[model samples]
Structures are given as C-alpha cells and as structure tokens.
Target: HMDEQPRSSYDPTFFKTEKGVEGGVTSMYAHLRYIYGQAYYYNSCLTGTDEATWGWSADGNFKDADLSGVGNLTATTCRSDALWGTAFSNINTANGVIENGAEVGVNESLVSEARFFRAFDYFLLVQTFGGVPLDLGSGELKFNITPSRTSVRNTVPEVYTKAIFPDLLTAIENLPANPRVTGGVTKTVARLYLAKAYLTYAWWLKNPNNIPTYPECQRTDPNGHDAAWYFQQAYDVAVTAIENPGPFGLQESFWMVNAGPNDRNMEILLYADHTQEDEYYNGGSLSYGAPDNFAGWMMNWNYTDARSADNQAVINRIAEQCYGRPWTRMAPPLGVFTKTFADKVNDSRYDGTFTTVYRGNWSTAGQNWESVTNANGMKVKEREPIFSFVFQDMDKIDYAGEGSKSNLGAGTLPDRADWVLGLDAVGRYVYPGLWKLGPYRTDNGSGAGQPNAGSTRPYNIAKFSELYLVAAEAAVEGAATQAGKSARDLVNVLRARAGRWTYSNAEYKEVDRDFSAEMTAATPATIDINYILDERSREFYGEGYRWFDLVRTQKWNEYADSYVICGGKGDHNPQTYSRTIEAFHYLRPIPQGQLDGMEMTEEEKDAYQNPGYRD
Candidate 1:
C-alpha cells in the first residue's frame, strides 16, 4: 500500500544510521538472557549432585537418588540444549542482523554488542562442553548441515586467548560504562567475565585433575602452577572489578533480598539483570532449606483431631509431656551431625543457617496444623494437628491439667471434668515444638485457621556469612589471607557471631580455653586442613554448602566413609552406608538424548564413557 514507514524502523536509505546499532544491541540482550538461564540450569545440576545437599524431603534425604547427571557429564552432553539451542538461535539472528543491519541503518555500537554477546555464549560452551564448532562466519557456514564437531581440545587455550578473549576485550573497548548501556553488556560485565576466564585458566593450567586427575601426578608430581599464582590472579581480577567505579561493590544492606532497588545493577559484579516483568524473574522468594509445610510436619508433633488413642500413647511414652509436641523429620543424619560439627557451637552463621535448637509445642489450636475429621467423626492420622515453637528463652507451658484438656478436643468430650481427671501422660500432653524458624502467622489476622496455619514466619537464610568461611579455607591453604588474620582467627570470628565465646591468644596464655584440649599441644605452625574443614561444617550447617566444600578439599572420601548407619561408632564399613569411588560416579553422565544425532569415533566414544555407560 506504500504506507509511510515508521520512524522507529531502520531505513536502508539512511545507511550507517544509529537505529541499526540500536537494533544490534537489542539482539545482544536476547543472547545474554539465554546465557543466564543456561547458567542457572547448569548450576542447579551441579548443586544437585554430591556437590551440595538438598534441604527438602524426597530428593535431599533419600540415599538411592542420583544427581550426578550434571556433575559427571561429558562434552557431548554439556552443551545444555536449551541454552545452546537459544544461543545458536540468537547467533543466527545476530548473523542475520550483521549482514543486513546496515540496510536498517543500525548503530555500530549495537553491532559490536551483538558480536560480544555471541562470543560470550561461545565462551560458556567451550568451558563447559569443550570443542564446540566456532561458526560465527555468515551465510552457508551458519546453516551448514551435518557440520562435524570441532576438535579444539588441543588448542583450547589458544581458542580462549584468540577467539573468546579478543571479542570481550573489543566489547569492553567499544561499550560505554554503566550509564551508557540499557539492559546491555557494559565494561564491568566484560571485566568480571575476563577475570573468571583468567581464574579458570590458572586453575586448568595447574590442576592435573582439571578434567580428570592423571594418576602419574598423584602426590608425587605437582604438575599444575603454584596455588599462590592462580589465587593472586583471581584476587587481582576481583579487586579490579571492585575498584572499577563501575556498578560494583557490596551494597549497603547486602542482607536484603534481591539487593533491593539496585537489584538491576548492584554489587553483584556480573549478574543476569531481570525486572519483575521478565518471565524468568518472578519476584518470589524461595527457601534454600525445606519449605514450612514439609519441614514443619517432620519436626513438629502431629495434633490432628484424628490422633488415635494409640498414637497418643506413643507420644506420651516418649517423655514428650509438654502440651504440644513436634516431630524431628529434619533430624541430622546421625553420624554426619555429631561427628562433623561436634564442637564450635558459637558460630553465628550456624545459628542463622541451621535449625539446631528445637522450639514450639504441637497443638491443633496452634498455627500451621490441620484438624480434619473422618466419616466416623474420628480424626485421620494424616490430618493430625502439629505445632512448632521458637527456640528462644521461653518458659515451658505446663500441660498437665487444664491446658492438656483444652488441646485434646475440649469441646466435644463426653465428660469434660472426668476426661481431664482420667488423663494420665497418655491423653494429657505432648512436648512443645522447637522453634528453629519463628512462630507461624496467617493473613486472616488470627493464626487459628486450620488450613493455613503455620503460614507465617518464613525461615530466613544466611548466605553472605558463608563468604567468610570460604575465605577462611583459602587462608588455610595459604592462598589468600587478609593482612593479619589467620585461618583460625577467621574461624573464631564466625564462632563468636554464632553466640560462642572465644579466647584470644593472649587470653589463652592466661587460661587454656581448649575445653577438649585437642588443640592444646598442636603448634600454631602445624594445624591441619581437616581442623579448618570441620570448623566450616559447624559454622555453615544446613545452608547446602558443606557437601561441596568437603569435595573440593579432598575430604569427601573420609567424610562419606565416616557416615555410619548406626552412627560412626565402629569400624569404617562400606556396607553400612559409605560411598566407594566409582570412576563414573565422580562426574555426572550426559543425558542420553543429547547423543542422538552426533557422530562419534571409537576413541571419542570411549573417552565419553561415563559410569554405567556400557550397562
């Protein structure tokens, strides 16, 4: 119809126009989003494996469940189809824009941003999957059918130095600082990534086990670069970003969720920024620990109207004679709890992280328990009442007389006075539920509603404090320590935060504070890393970091072996719940569907073999 063209549309007649660049920059956002989503998925996979423990019931507590699919995956399966699919899809779009964007009069800066984004995606692919086909050239090459897998393992270092590094460097050079870009890559993003790349390089060059540990270099031959060198490079990159004056640095109140108003551009050196409008960025807070419903049921006592006389007898016999009682579902795997963090109870992070102290009394009247009656007017065991209490210094409520009758169906009893009189410990009282998190609240003003009880007092998480523990580990290895802080001193600082008192070296000189006297004779010069690892367990329980922290420090084998079904009282028995070193178990297997159309040589196939592959 020869309609007038919209002013927003890039007109070919206006070649070399700013509109073309803007279009190109817009395309980069699409690519960045894909990468962030991929990172989240992959990180989730990694955490699910032995690297981190789950907090909720089924997946977290079960012994037979396996999560190594992501941890032990090979190059063929590491591409993360969703991520790579989106990445390649965007790469094609970027290529299309670069070829014809000039006609649209797009800006050069936008074109540069697109290039940087495409390169960044490729960089992620190379690091995770390795030897990804580098196809940035235009036209037929982009759409090549049956394109063979590129073998860049030998030249992987050069690929980083050549293809990936230059694109990022150029992107930083071309892109403006924080103020210049709108939902687009800036110099700070580029720098943070660059630092990560350098850190990866340093780690890869030094650790023989970068992919798999070579047996020949075991203990006898140290093949990698010195640990100090790699750490210093990592420190340099982190510090540069810190001082860059770009949008980086710890926020004023780092404890607030989503980093508050500055959520888009906060101290998170490099992050995927999403507004509430973004599909992925739903403004919901998730508990890393178990949710209230599942966690509450397990830890608190059941108080349903259906609490059979038999179930009531069991509760009464256990000496849990408080008005209400709580169940201990999140009970620490026996051996793991007592042996791992036996001491060091003073750590503030521990209090913030773990539900160590039990609180609250289980009652149908209390918040969060359901009271459903069966056809015969009896309460079903499933619909029993449960209550959880806070572990603060509250005086115990005596449920021996009237308080006991009130909770045990006070209104419907045939002989209210007689029922109260006949009550022994059996139909009388249950222990108060422990308050690991806080008291439950409800929107209806009163927490007495049956269905929505225990809906309030969502558990708060302590994540930032973990950084100090990680720092302490680094300090232990002589990798990175602040001016005068020793690893032990750092540990004690965390302990003090958890409400534990610690004596200074000078105080120790006046009176020995090592209650166990385990460390009294040990010289300050020869404290082993095991001690530090144990301290971490005590300080960071239930936060989902312990499993991975143990693995990285080579203490997983001992820790896993130490875990005993009957509690680690006897000899180390594999049959009694211990993990053996199954080679394939070390990493996750690639998902089977990923290998559907890929070509594979015999050696390549053998190299890709994961645990139980042949089976």
Candidate 2:
C-alpha cells in the first residue's frame, strides 16, 4: 500500500488529500546526507586527526602548522560548488514541497517543516559565503539577467534574527515532539539548530573584533559584530534544548555502544544518518574510528600505498617504526586529543577514541595462503595475525626493521649484499589501499583495492561528546551569573561525566588552571571568557573543533603563528605572515566565474567595490 503510485500529480494537494505527505516528510530525512558531507569537510580541515598527504607536503599537519595556501583552500573550488549546489538543491526541494503541498492542502505542520528546511539551507549559504542572494518565491530567474549577490551580511545578530531564529521557532511549533516519521524533523532537531544558531550569534557578538589567522586572507572591517553576545545567545539556546523534552543526552559508553549501524541512533541531539547503502556513505566509523588502510596509513603510518618506489620505501619505514610503537602518525594533535579526552582518560571511551600503544608480537595464523579447490569448494588460508602485548618494562625488542633486511637484529646495514638486494626486490610490494565509502557488492570484488578496502571499515559516528560542550558554552554565554548558573557550571557537569573530580569554589578557587606544574594547579575563581574558550580547546580536540573555534574566537593568529614556529616544520615567512590581519584569509575569495556572472545594481556595485571586491 505504501508503494502504490498516486493518480494525482506530485503536487502539494497530493500530500494533503493523499498519503503523499509521508513522502514529503521522508524527503526531510535526506538532509542527513548533506550533514554527512559537511562533516567530512569539517573533519578534513579543522580536525588534524585525519590523515592528509596534502598536509604532509606542507608540513601543516598540526595546530602549529601554517595556514598560508597550504592545500586547505585548494579544494575551495570543489567545496564552493558542492556548498552552493547542495544547499540550493535542498532549498529548491523544500520550496517545491511547500508550493505543491499547499496546493494539495497538505498538513500545515508539513508546510512549516518545508519552510524550516529552506531557511536552514539559506543559513548555511550566508554563513559560508558571506551575503548570498535571497531566493525565495517560486519562479525561474530570467536567463542573461544575472542576479547580483544580495547583501545579507547584516550584522550576525540581524541575520540570525531574520533567518535562523524564526525558522527554528516555526519548526519547533510544527515538528513532532519526537523524530517519528522515519527520519523526519523532531523537536530535538529544532532545539539543536536553535541552540547552534544562538551560540554562533553569541560568539560573533562576544568577539566582534576577532579575525581569522591562517592564509591571511579574510579581513573584516572594524564594524564587525561583537562575539560575546553571540556566545551568550548560543549558551541560552543550548541550555533550553538540554532541558527540553527530546532525545538529547550523553550516552554513558558512547564509543562501544554506538559503533556501526546503531551509530545512526546514538545520543544525537541533531544528526543525519547515512547507512552503507546511502548514496553518500557518512558513517564516520571508516575514517574516524576504524583502523582501515586509509585510517591506518594516515594515523598509523605516514604512508600505506604509494606509486613510487621512493615513497613506498618511506612509507614502509614509517610502518615498521609504527608496528609496536604508539601510533603517533595517527595521533590527534595535542590541542584536539587533549581537549576531547581530558577528563575521560580513565573511561572506556578513551580506549575507543585513541589507539593505545601496545608492544606486541603479531604472527600469521596457519590458514591456507592459497585457495584449495575441492567438492566442498575453494578454501583459502585464513590470514589471522595474532597480537600479544609485550611487557612494558622491556627497553627494546627485535622487530621487523624498515624496508627488507636480511639480518633482522641489526638495523638497516650500510654495506650488505643481501640488504641491498632485499631493498631493491621486496621493497616493490605495494600495500593494499583503502576505499572511501560505498555500498557493499560481492560482484564488485567487495573489499579489494583502496576503494573497497576503505569501505570495509565504515565506522560512522552518530553522536560526539562535544555537543554538550557546545550546550555549556551556549548556556553560560546566554545568561551568566543567573542564580549560580554559569558556563563553567555546565562545563563542570560534562567534565564530571568524563570521570574528573568535580571542583568547587572552596576546593579550587579558580576556573583557570596552570598546567605548567607537575600537577595542574587551578587559579582563583574567575569567570573570564577566555578561560571558557580555553576549556573548550582542551575538552574538544580532535573531535574537530580546533580551527573553526579559533576563527570564531578571533584567536587563530595567536595559535597558528605560535604553533608554526614551535613545530619547527613547513615553509613559512614569519616577516610576511601578518597574523593580526589574517581573518581576510579565513574565507576564500568568491570564484572568478561567479564575479563575472554577477549583474549588480549601481548601489550593489558600490557596496562590492571594497578592496578585493570583484562583482
């Protein structure tokens, strides 16, 4: 019955008169795919936890890495296209649903949900690309009459008030109390978006003068909005959502319980789930949690598979060193890992989140290496590598050395015939590569090569522990000192969840602690906003809040510059690098093609006439 085709046209009337509203509601579920795409981009750039050959080239692999033209923005073209294409597509789809659903006398709530989605897409555009052209109403733009980019760079407050807030309110009013329509919007989703919008607004208001640091490209005028108020607003919305009735709470043991397909239903306040079958496989498990070749290559070793013999040699060396050592290659930069794992060091989640360095001997189990064909069928040897931890006290042990070595005990010998021959011959063996993500198909030689190998480790992460941190930030910034409720109070609650000893005014007089000492010492009680921001950095780490938070807080320059020199890696010109004016670099310039296509009015042209303005 659900699959029966409706006789009516695919219009709004079909939704109301027929059971087509179910399909419209189902369309909302598709937004999860978009969320996954966005998350992928965020993880690649902001979180250094993931591996990047590009980062290796520039040595911009950590917080201290340079931001100048380091392939971070290289994908700007592709990302811009994706951002615009995807957002506009969603907007248009939502609009179509709204327009047709109305004609069919669809449920008013369903119509409202469409509007909410439209506004949501628009918000992403405005935030990502500055002011975007406002395109509401149903009509095709005339060809050759290129529309100029509308100035929606209203103060951060104005944009949120005009676009995000109203849509969220309407969504809350119309959406079901729970997400019941098989992936439809729920009260929790509305609340989460509200909280996010408010928090973003609060940050903008609180640090109006802050500019981004890397790439030194995105500078804003002094008329920038304040960031403190935005932070406050963010806090308020987060707190409200937390207290509201919805599925928004921290899972006690998130990493283990929310591992695979169930990751879609983990403690997600607001999320979009993509199963392996989905067009865009967003399960974070493959790239983030699982130990596949790609994850293994970047995190475990510097390289796994390479086309060149030289690169292969380097990769093999990196892997040999990584065999029994703590996997530093995959380790989250200190800022990222420390922040997310700070209080939860002893919790089971830490084990799930980090790869524990263990000394061990791994041997191939005696299964047939080659396929054995018989009446029963072909039986291939099971290649199971047994891993057993070595004693921690051992100073050193004999393990496989880098490249092929005839004598294993001695490291690579300088003048040995066997060593020379081994390096020249066995060094050519290319490791199996990992795939990104895709549906499993046995006919496609499932789990072969990079693409298939990568797909096998699909570990989608549905919920992250940092949402609560965002909530804490929103709450404190929204209303500080309101009946003893502060941002610090919210943070302390999360820290408590991570198994940290709760501190009170009497025990530790200060919220800021100096980690310089052998034991981290707390300062006297103070509600300085910087302390909260720093706490966020320490708590959130590789979960992917580093660069964005720095940009949001206008502290990217301070961190990026300090780290560049401290890391002692990468090509950087200290004299030419202007950290203070680095915000201009934060945003990529509007594409050359977009500029040429714009049809600006005199007033619009004048507004766009600022330095580096194109259209």
Candidate 3:
C-alpha cells in the first residue's frame, strides 16, 4: 500500500480534478454519437415495427430485427447492440463524475450533468432491455474501481423509482434554463425526460395490454403514485416546459426543423454533434466513409442507378440536403405514404420529410450536355426534375418495364418530361428517400457534397415541438386539461403549424402558403389515443421514435403486424407482409456480447436474458 501503484488517466480518481470533472461530463455528450446516428440503432428503433422494414441490401442484422420469418432474433443477432455496451460504459463514467463532482467541490451544475446522463442512459436501457443492472461493480449506482463479471438486474419498478426519477428531478432543479454550450443539456431537457419517464412509467403501471415485465416485478410503483397521478404529472410537466421554453421553440415551418441550412434551429432541444470543419471531430472522414451518421442513407433508394433517355446516364448521385448516398437497406411501408401522410396537399410534412422528386445533376458529374431526353421522349435539363415519385395515381401513364428506355422502370405521363411512379409502385429498391436526415455540406460549391460520406449534420434526438405531443398524449390518457389546452387544442397547434409553409422543398421556392383553417377543421370533435398515435407518426416518421412510441403505448402489433410493399425494383405488384410481434419482443435481449463477457453459468446467462431470445 505504501508503493504507488500504476494507474491510468481514465481512473475514477481523476474525476476529482476540475478538468477531469469537465471531461467526464463532456464524454457523456460525446457518447451519443455511438447510439443516435448509427444506422443499425436507427434500424432497431424503427425497422421491426410500423415505421419501416428491411430493404433490398439488408442482411441478418436488419432481417433478424424485423421479427419476420426470414431470420432468428436470438441474443447474437439483436440490434440492441447500439445501446448495450455503449450506454453502460457511459453510465459508469457518469457514475464516476456523480460520485466525485460533489466531493471535489465543483459547481452543482457539473454534478447535475452527470446525474442527467446517468438517468438518460438507464431510461434508454430500461425501455429497450428491461431491468439492467444498477450496480456495475463496487456497489449500487456507485463508481467502480474494478471490473466485475457477475451482474444482477434490478426490477423495473426499482430501476425507475431508485434511478431515473430521482436523478431527473435533481437535474431539473440544478440544470440551467439554457444549455451551457450549444447542444448541451438544460432544465427543459430534464423536464422532457422526466415527463417521458412519468408517461412511460404510467403506461407500465397501467399495463393495459397485460404485457409481461422482465426481471419480473409486480407492475406497481414503489412510490405508490397510481398510473393516473403519473399521467397528470406528465401532462403538467410537459406543459410547463412548453410554456417556459428558455432558448427553445418550434421552427417557423415543419420543413425548417430538419432543413440542412437550419438544422440547429430553435426547435431542436438535443442533438448528437458533428461538424463539417474537422474529420476527427466529426468522428468520420469528411470525404466519404461511414459508421458516421448514415441512418439517412439506409432509406434512400439508389437514384444513381437511373438513366436518362438517349440511353445515357444523365444523373449523378450528388449529395445535397434533399438527396444523399443510398444504401437502400431500409424501406418505408406503403402506409407511410397512403395513410400517415394522407393529406399531402394540406400537410407540408409529407413533402418536407421525403425526397419525392429526383432532379438532374449530370452537370456536377462533369457532363457537358445541357439537355437530355427523359420520359415521354421529352427534354430535361440540369437542375430540372427528371423523376417524380407521385403519391397520387394517374390513369393515362404508360409504365416503362424492365430493360426499357427509362432504365429506372418508372412510368411516363403524357407531355411530362419527368419519369413518374405512383405511391403504390414504390418498391423495395426504388422508394423515396428520407429527406429530413439527408446529407448537407457547404463545401459543395455549384455541385455536390461527398455523397458516400456519413452526414455531417448533427442527427437530431429531441425537439421542443414534442412537448405539445407529450402533453396531448397525457391529456388523451385521462390527464386533466386546462380550459384552452385540451388534447385537441394541443394537437391543433402543431396541425396549424403544419398547414403553414414558407417554402416548398419539392418546388424549390418560397410559397408562403397557409391552410390553417382547413387543417384545424379536419380535426375531429373528440380525440383518442389512436388519433394521437397517427399524428405522432405523421410528425416524427423515420426519426427513430416509432418503436418506443408503439411499445410505450402497447400498440405495436395493431399497427405494424401487417404491411404492404412492392417486390424489388421491377415488380410493381404490391404484396402484404406480416410479422410475428410476440409479447416477449417487448424487451430486446441482453446482447450476447454482454452475456459472453459475464462469468455467470450458461443457465444464469439464460436467466439474465429476456424471454423468447434464449435459443
């Protein structure tokens, strides 16, 4: 004990120093990059449930999560890999800071940051793989100096009452109204998490669907607050955040929220940060490589595969804010178009969220030719729309079959130069790409950015706009509403915003259109949870919120069990696909990687994992 032992700089004792305290807190923010922007994590968040399905290029990782018959959903193949190791490592770091910051006499705010992160990671883990361990090694929620192989999971109620709720409550009190830096945590974010926690916990307590809880506790709150009481608290807290927004507020239009040029708009409360200036800081190459923010690329169809008339390639896969690299690994079901965004004309969100039109960019690809013959043997020039994924069905259009002149297997309307395809005709390999999360870079002057590179734009995680939805959802769940702030009123605020468009993404111009009256008029006299869910999908589609939303409400199977999509590129005939979303799938398995590291016996490991993944 007298001799100085060899120690790493990463030791928990370092967190007692001021710089080390700041670094520990900063790492909490940096850890988000490993989870939020990752494509497989994005897949786990949406693909298995209603929002999306595996695309043409998907392998076992995508197929297994689909809960379809194509692949097994064992612990080895589960996509929850996104959260398991990544979050727990961060959680331990958080524990170190929380345990040391106060003792080191640092600002309470720094200590609170670690508290928020500790709860945040636990919330995500509990929601994904229920009842994760509170004790890493030394003791429950304590900083561990040594590693431990044997782990024990706390029950669902214990994790929430002992961990998430208390930390968030403390964070809300100590955190500043505004973030310390851009993309930093704030009281508003703390409130948002607390509200969400309350809402999720209420749902768990209600357990309306009789879904089983793992680590198997009786669905009772340790604090003894009933489900109804929690729902009211959720509503009040969400409304409080909405009313007292510090530096956060909704964007002017739905499009502006995710717009490449305006990505850091006031609407965004939290995002995983990346910059165009430095590849090292961006966490990937600026030119072209991934394991960066590539979730956007997964849904984008291979537009580069299309050709212009005269049998020549006239389009290049230029990376713009609207269009980016296409992996074609995930495809949205037809319901995303036909039902969720049904009012495409009135709602700007549909156009704002999708790359419905593919324009010509051959000039950027070094093609000198200004004009090219496109669909219907007509002329299209650079910067002109060469193809359009039409949401509306048109009668007199003639489809160009496989090996036809169009080469994209798209149809042609009379007198139209752009290739056309109805919403139903959108297939696994040729559907619309997610425009909201597409790539963006200022360096691409008069041409394109690096299409193959992961998106430099910070992937948005939470938004101020969600406060309205959270409050509305709580109200619908029997939380008492204020005189002017009923569930419908809260929803109409967003709907009215949706109707007002300052610019059209597809038209590429400022329209200054407002259909607020029409949009609000369409709202039914009475609102239900079903209507609330539909609106949630419309507003936040493909943003990695679908799976959590469905699971929290116990509505996964009713919405996603069956879906329709066309066979790959040339096969326009739509077919229905069904998934077996069993109750055990509610909690993803403890990652096999985690199980493999544990010193527990095989039987103990099986007991540790979620049921139905024990194979």
- Model 3 C-alpha lDDT per residue in residues 1-615, reported as the tens digit of each score: 100122254666788877887888887788888888899888899987778988999888888888878888878787887688778888888778887777877787878988998899999999999998898778998876567778899998888999999999999889999889878899998899999999999999999998999998898887999999999999999998988899999877898998899988888889998662323434553553324888898888888877776777767777787678888888988888877888988898999899888887887877788688877667888778887888655555578442256567588876677888888877788888899989988898767667888888999999887888899999999999987789999999999999999888777788988988999999989898788889999889999999889999999989989988887777788889999999999998888887888788999988988898888
TM-score of each: 0.50, 0.61, 0.95
lDDT of 3 at 258: 89
Q: Give the candidate order by descending lDDT.
A: 3, 2, 1
- Per-residue alpha-carbon lDDT of candidate 2 for residues 1-615, written as tens digits (9 for 90 to 100): 001112323444454542565555455556535444342333343422111112222223322223334324322232333355556555555555665666667776766676667666766654555544444222421111122244223333444565567768877788777655544566666666666665655555454565432212233323354555555555555566567756546644333233332344536544444432333335644442211212223333222221111111111121221231112222233332233334432332343333222111111122222422211122212221111111221233222343222121111222211111111111101111111121222332211222224323223322334545676655545445344346556555444444432221111122333222211223224444455555654443333345555555565555544222112121111122222224554543443444334465756543432223333
lDDT of 1 by residue, 1-615 (tens): 000112223333222446654654564554443434232232322232322221122232222222322123333333244454555555554444544553554654556566566566655544434434345322231322223342212134544555566666666676666635544556666655554454444544554333442111122113234556654544454444444646543332211212122233343333333321223323585433211222233323333321223233211211211212233222233343335534333222322333222212234334343333322244433222222222221233233323332344222222211111111111112222222322222332322234323222222222233334444554554556455445565454444343422322111112212222332322245345676666655543433334344434545455543222211111112223334435333333333443443466655644443434433
Best by TM-score: 3
Whole-model lDDT, model 2:
0.39
Q: Give candidate 2 misplaced runs (Cα > 4 Å).
A: 1-25, 34-40, 43-54, 57-66, 69-80, 99-105, 136-158, 210-233, 276-344, 347-350, 357-467, 475-478, 481-485, 500-547, 562-581, 591-615
Query: How does candidate 3 score on lDDT?
Result: 0.84
Tell me model 1's lDDT, rounded to 2 decimals. 0.37
Q: Which should have the higher TM-score, number 1 or number 2?
A: 2
Arrange candidates by TM-score, descending: 3, 2, 1
- Which pairs of residues have clashing backbones in candidate 3? none
